[PDB]
Amino acid sequence: MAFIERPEDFLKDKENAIQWEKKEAERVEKNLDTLEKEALELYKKDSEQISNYSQTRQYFYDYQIESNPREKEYKNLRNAISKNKIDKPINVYYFESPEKFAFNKEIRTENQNEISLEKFNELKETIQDKLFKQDGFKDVSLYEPGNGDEKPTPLLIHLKLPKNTGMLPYINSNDVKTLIEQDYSIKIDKIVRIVIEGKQYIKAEASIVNSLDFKDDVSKGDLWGKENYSDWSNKLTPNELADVNDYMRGGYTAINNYLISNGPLNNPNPELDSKVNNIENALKLTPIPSNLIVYRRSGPQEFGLTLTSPEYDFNKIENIDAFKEKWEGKVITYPNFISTSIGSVNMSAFAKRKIILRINIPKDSPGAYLSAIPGYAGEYEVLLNHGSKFKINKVDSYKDGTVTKLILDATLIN
Amino acid sequence: TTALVCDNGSGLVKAGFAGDDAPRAVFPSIVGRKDSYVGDEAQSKRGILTLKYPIEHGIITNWDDMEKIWHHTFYNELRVAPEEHPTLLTEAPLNPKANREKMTQIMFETFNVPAMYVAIQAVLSLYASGRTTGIVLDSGDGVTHNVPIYEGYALPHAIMRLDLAGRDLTDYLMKILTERGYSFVTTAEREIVRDIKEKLCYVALDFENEMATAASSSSLEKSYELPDGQVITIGNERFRCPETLFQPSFIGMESAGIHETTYNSIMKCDIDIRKDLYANNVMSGGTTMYPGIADRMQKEITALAPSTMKIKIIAPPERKYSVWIGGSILASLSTFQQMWITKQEYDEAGPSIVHRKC
Ligand SMILES: NC(=O)c1ccc[n+]([C@@H]2O[C@H](COP(=O)([O-])OP(=O)(O)OC[C@H]3O[C@@H](n4cnc5c(N)ncnc54)[C@H](O)[C@@H]3O)[C@@H](O)[C@H]2O)c1
Ligand SMILES: Nc1ncnc2c1ncn2[C@@H]1O[C@H](COP(=O)(O)OP(=O)(O)OP(=O)(O)O)[C@@H](O)[C@H]1O
Numbered sequence: 001m002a003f004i005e006r007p008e009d010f011l012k013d014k015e016n017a018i019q020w021e022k023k024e025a026e027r028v029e030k031n032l033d034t035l036e037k038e039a040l041e042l043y044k045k046d047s048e049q050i051s052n053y054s055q056t057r058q059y060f061y062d063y064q065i066e067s068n069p070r071e072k073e074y075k076n077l078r079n080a081i082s083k084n085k086i087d088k089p090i091n092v093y094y095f096e097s098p099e100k101f102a103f104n105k106e107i108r109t110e111n112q113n114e115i116s117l118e119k120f121n122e123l124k125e126t127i128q129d130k131l132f133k134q135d136g137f138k139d140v141s142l143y144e145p146g147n148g149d150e151k152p153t154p155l156l157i158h159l160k161l162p163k164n165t166g167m168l169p170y171i172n173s174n175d176v177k178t179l180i181e182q183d184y185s186i187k188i189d190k191i192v193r194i195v196i197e198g199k200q201y202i203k204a205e206a207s208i209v210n211s212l213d214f215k216d217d218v219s220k221g222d223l224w225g226k227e228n229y230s231d232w233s234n235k236l237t238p239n240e241l242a243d244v245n246d247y248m249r250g251g252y253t254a255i256n257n258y259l260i261s262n263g264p265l266n267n268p269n270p271e272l273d274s275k276v277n278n279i280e281n282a283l284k285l286t287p288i289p290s291n292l293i294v295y296r297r298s299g300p301q302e303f304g305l306t307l308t309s310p311e312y313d314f315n316k317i318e319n320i321d322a323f324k325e326k327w328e329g330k331v332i333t334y335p336n337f338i339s340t341s342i343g344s345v346n347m348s349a350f351a352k353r354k355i356i357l358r359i360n361i362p363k364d365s366p367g368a369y370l371s372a373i374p375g376y377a378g379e380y381e382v383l384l385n386h387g388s389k390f391k392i393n394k395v396d397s398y399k400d401g402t403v404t405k406l407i408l409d410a411t412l413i414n
Numbered sequence: 415t416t417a418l419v420c421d422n423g424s425g426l427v428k429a430g431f432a433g434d435d436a437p438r439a440v441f442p443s444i445v446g447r448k449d450s451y452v453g454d455e456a457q458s459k460r461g462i463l464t465l466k467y468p469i470e471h472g473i474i475t476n477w478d479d480m481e482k483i484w485h486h487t488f489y490n491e492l493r494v495a496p497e498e499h500p501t502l503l504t505e506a507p508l509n510p511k512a513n514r515e516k517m518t519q520i521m522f523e524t525f526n527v528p529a530m531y532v533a534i535q536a537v538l539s540l541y542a543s544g545r546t547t548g549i550v551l552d553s554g555d556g557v558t559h560n561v562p563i564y565e566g567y568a569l570p571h572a573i574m575r576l577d578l579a580g581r582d583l584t585d586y587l588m589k590i591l592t593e594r595g596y597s598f599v600t601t602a603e604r605e606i607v608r609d610i611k612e613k614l615c616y617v618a619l620d621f622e623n624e625m626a627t628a629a630s631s632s633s634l635e636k637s638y639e640l641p642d643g644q645v646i647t648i649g650n651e652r653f654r655c656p657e658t659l660f661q662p663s664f665i666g667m668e669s670a671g672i673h674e675t676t677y678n679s680i681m682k683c684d685i686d687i688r689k690d691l692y693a694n695n696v697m698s699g700g701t702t703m704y705p706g707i708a709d710r711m712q713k714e715i716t717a718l719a720p721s722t723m724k725i726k727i728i729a730p731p732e733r734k735y736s737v738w739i740g741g742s743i744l745a746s747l748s749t750f751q752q753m754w755i756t757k758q759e760y761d762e763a764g765p766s767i768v769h770r771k772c
């Protein structure tokens with residue numbers, strides 16, 4: 001039997017989960033207009049490509065994004081999902097490739113039944129203490145897969161979704177399904193080895209962490225930045241505004257080269273030292289007021305490469321693999337102050353740069369929306385503090401025309 | 415009574431009198447080291463002195479030094495008193511508001527001009543050809559912009575800027591000439607190579623085909639006599655150098671090239687005006703002087719634009735001085751005279767009067 005209020009987790013109660021979601025699907029059909037129902041029908045017919053598009057749409061030029069006819073399906077489906085918000089948390093289930101969480105080898109083969117202690121521990125060490133960014137449309141289940149269910153990988157994600165998460169229950173032929181648009185980071189709180197129908201699986205107990213991510217909506221990001229850093233702009237000492245404007249006006253190159261070469265030890269320059277101190281103090285004046293995603297198009301030199309390095313040809317998979325082996329899971333540190341943007345869109349000045357850092361900035365980190373300073377709004381810039389450290393959680397790749405580019409999912413850790 | 419026109423660039427100041435067809439004075443935008451040295455002055459004193467460029471990438475970055483350049487302009491180059499002439503200054507596209515204010519403060523408070531105005535360089539260059547609608551490629555010594563303009567208004571959200579221009583091309587030519595087996599490395603040698611660049615370089619219509627040609631013939635070789643009589647040869651460097659504008663990866667830059675920034679600029683404009691822009695691509699500035707550049711731009715934009723698009727590149731012979739000429743025309747216009755900011759208006763309103771009126 002079923003209670004008259006649903007649980008937060010249907011667990012193994014597949015029969016009630018399916019019936020409840022079937023009722024929900026019927027109820028939500030009352031609230032979708034025909035363009036939204038059209039978007040859903042197209043998704044049933046082309047889910048992989050539509051989901052793929054939804055993961056990387058934001059990285060192109062603003063006018064390329066606007067001109068893509070796939071925007072219609074994306075926006076209409078996203079609207080359909082966004083407005084059926086849950087009234088309390090719910091737990092969902094789905095399978096991932098281990099590669100999704102930067103475990104770039106099999107946990108066990110399809111034919112194997114058990115998972116070694118070795119592999120279990122390797123997996124734990126790889127996915128612990130990391131916040132993994134999730135994007136795009138995804139089909140999830142409200143019940144745990146059991147005997148006779150489809151189970152494509154050895155990795156089962158058991159994810160708690162909070163109140164106000166958008167979820168779209170729907171029917172596809174004989175099947176009741178649940179669609180979400182991922183817009184958050186997940187943390188793996190705990191992994192456990194379980195057995196389902198004679199085979200060992202890893203079950204990852206996962207929760208989410210929200211961050212503001214403006215992606216290609218630079219106007220919205222700019223409004224947010226101006227709202228939070230208009231006062232900041234006015235609250236600096238005259239030395240701090242002076243040293244800040246010097247930095248932004250191109251002084252950054254000397255200041256940062258002094259930092260990178262370890263000038264404060266090898267060539268102490270008290271003038272520069274005072275500027276570094278003032279700018280740092282400026283960045284601590286109004287700490288980043290929410291968890292925030294920022295984007296940086298890195299030069300290859302930040303990753304020990306040049307334009308003519310053979311290893312910078314990411315169109316060859318072996319170079320992507322070599323990149324991952326060197327950087328994925330590592331912590332990197334910038335002695336320099338570091339420019340980032342509120343927006344993910346490509347821009348003329350760095351149109352050809354192949355390495356994109358996508359950085360999770362925890363609330364209260366030092367930082368400032370410099371583009372609140374009336375002098376230059378067209379960067380949508382957030383400046384991060386000198387000596388910042390970033391954990392590289394995961395490396396993804398995508399095609400920009402014929403050129404393979406990398407997205408480094410990173411977290412600011414100090 | 416006569417107005418002054420001062421077009422201040424990263425490498426050169428072009429200065430003269432409104433009404434004239436050309437600037438009376440063209441001199442380097444440099445200072446050496448209170449009374450510190452300026453126009454060529456700061457190279458004949460390059461010893462106890464280092465030469466400094468106060469305008470960087472089209473933006474004034476040192477106001478003390480820029481006051482010296484402007485002092486030099488009035489008293490030494492034009493031999494006029496600033497108190498006796500309305501003065502039209504030029505500015506880069508997207509010049510910060512505070513920068514234009516500081517230009518205005520200096521003109522009235524330091525030089526005590528009776529009136530002044532600040533005009534956008536690219537808009538002046540479009541105006542020089544009798545146009546008020548078009549997309550300008552302005553490329554000088556320090557910066558290159560794409561500036562779309564519709565009925566006299568620059569469209570700031572579609573302006574593209576690349577910190578890649580003539581001085582970068584000169585430095586690149588020094589490097590690749592040095593790789594050929596010559597040695598161009600010093601300040602004086604940079605001037606020589608600038609001269610080689612201005613005399614012998616060209617943009618190839620098909621770069622990969624041109625490289626193949628040069629590889630398998632001497633047909634593209636030219637000679638150049640150094641000041642000491644040494645004659646040198648230049649080959650594929652003639653076109654590899656300005657190729658950098660279309661392929662900024664040649665100097666380690668991962669930016670779009672000038673054809674792509676032109677396209678990006680047009681694509682940021684309202685769809686209704688894009689054909690007007692395609693049909694009125696105007697080139698301005700010294701770094702647009704390369705033979706072959708208009709044909710190559712035509713070819714590259716043709717490949718990006720819809721197959722039905724009609725594209726025209728306008729590259730007048732005078733385009734090294736297009737900005738200055740447009741300023742000379744503008745300052746002379748009857749309908750412009752009401753637009754001058756007077757000393758009286760400055761006294762009444764702040765430096766911020768320059769937004770009211772410019
Ligand atoms: N890159 C971006 O995504 C971005 C975002 C917002 C604003 N901006 C704007 O662009 C300009 C800054 O440009 P930038 O960030 O491309 O230049 P940068 O000063 O960060 O980098 C200059 C060069 O140094 C390299 N570099 C930087 N830090 C390094 C390190 N720790 N080790 C080794 N190499 C290192 C870079 O790869 C590049 O080749 C500023 O005007 C800024 O406002 C850029
Ligand atoms: N015939 C030519 N061919 C190629 N380049 C040239 C030619 N004549 C001048 N130049 C280059 O053009 C530049 C000077 O042009 P211009 O005076 O338009 O620039 P600027 O206004 O000083 O700088 P900017 O506009 O970038 O601030 C120099 O780099 C010079 O070498």
Ligand SMILES: C/C1=C/C(=O)O[C@@H]2C[C@@H](CC[C@H](C)/C=C/C=C/CC1)O[C@@](O)([C@@H]1CSC(=O)N1)C2
Nearest residue numbers: 425426442443454457555580581584604605608
């Ligand atoms: C005919 C001429 C043109 C010119 O454009 O010079 C400008 C100004 C010049 C100043 C430095 C030298 C030493 C002093 C020079 C007096 C020069 C008049 C020279 O520095 C440039 O040469 C730079 C360096 S090399 C290059 O590509 N841009 C641009």
Ligand SMILES: [Ca+2]
Nearest residue numbers: 423424535554
């Ligand atoms: Ca200029």
